[PDB]
Design a protein around this ligand. Sequence first.
Ligand SMILES: Nc1ncnc2c1ncn2[C@@H]1O[C@H](CO)[C@@H](O)[C@H]1O
Ligand SMILES: [Cl-]
Length: 345
Amino acid sequence: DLSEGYVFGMGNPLLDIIVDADDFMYRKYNLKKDNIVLAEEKHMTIYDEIQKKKKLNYIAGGATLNTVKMIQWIIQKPFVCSYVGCIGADIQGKYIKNDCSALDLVTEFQIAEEPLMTGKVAVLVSEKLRSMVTYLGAACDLSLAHIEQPHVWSLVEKAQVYYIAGFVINTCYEGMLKIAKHSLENEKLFCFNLSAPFLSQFNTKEVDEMISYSNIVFGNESEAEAYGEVHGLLEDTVHATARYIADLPFADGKKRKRLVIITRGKNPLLYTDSSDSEIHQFMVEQFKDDQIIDTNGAGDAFAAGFIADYIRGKPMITSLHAAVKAAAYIICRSGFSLGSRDSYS
Ligand SMILES: Nc1ncnc2c1ncn2[C@@H]1O[C@H](CO)[C@@H](O)[C@H]1O
Ligand SMILES: [Cl-]
């Protein structure tokens, strides 16, 4: 039985705009399979462009928010989870806020000065490729000032577990660094997601600094590969990355266990920790082609499923099964959609 506000997240609350994309779109915007890029000026027309498409699916997104609200949904006790992010003063932001309240997720949103609008993600779906283009928008305005308000910082102080995705490096590194230091100094549980290859490539300093306060690190194969390359881990890159991340000193230099989990799609996921000489494979339930509805957000669900069980005392293997279950539930649904809790099985 977990205390209220036991779990705290901060991140970028975003609206996902899911569209069946034509094949030209990927060439036109130079987009890649299973990837995400932050919108540059050359990308900006995509939002007006996909808005001309029918069958648009609008749904609340944001990597950290996805994970934290599913932890809340899984555990099913009201107000166990807390979330902080920055939205705009528009209908999109209000929809995202109402979605959180419907889930019994305690929030303290910062509202961006008008007319800065709530961030959005163009999620381009096709049989050939899936790809995301993110316009952070209001999420950038998330500040240390808002986080340090007595009524918001108190959510951080009461939490024993934190989840922050690497994506927040781009929006409020100062805040996530402050929370990370608070966690380590108080011997709490800080969970960190590598989130995307571009973070390890262009924000290497920030990723490695975050790892040094993280008790648990989540990643996927492409993130491990990009991380490995940037660190000169030429051979055996994915295994080497898992070992390297697990063994990085903590910021206070204190001897401590860090757990690293690298997912690999349909292939066995890898896990190890700093006390473990070996890297373990964990077999994953094989999916048929027709079973897969939408894998977008599966990694976010995986993290939620793992943490929700792990923080309630379930052993490593049991928690991994819970993580796969979470991801599988999301894979069989469109966008990060959480239905009635009774049907979770
Ligand atoms: N730059 C970003 N920051 C936070 N979340 C993001 C970012 N880009 C994509 N996402 C989210 O990642 C989710 C898929 O893991 C989508 O719901 C999408 O909204
Ligand atoms: Cl996020």
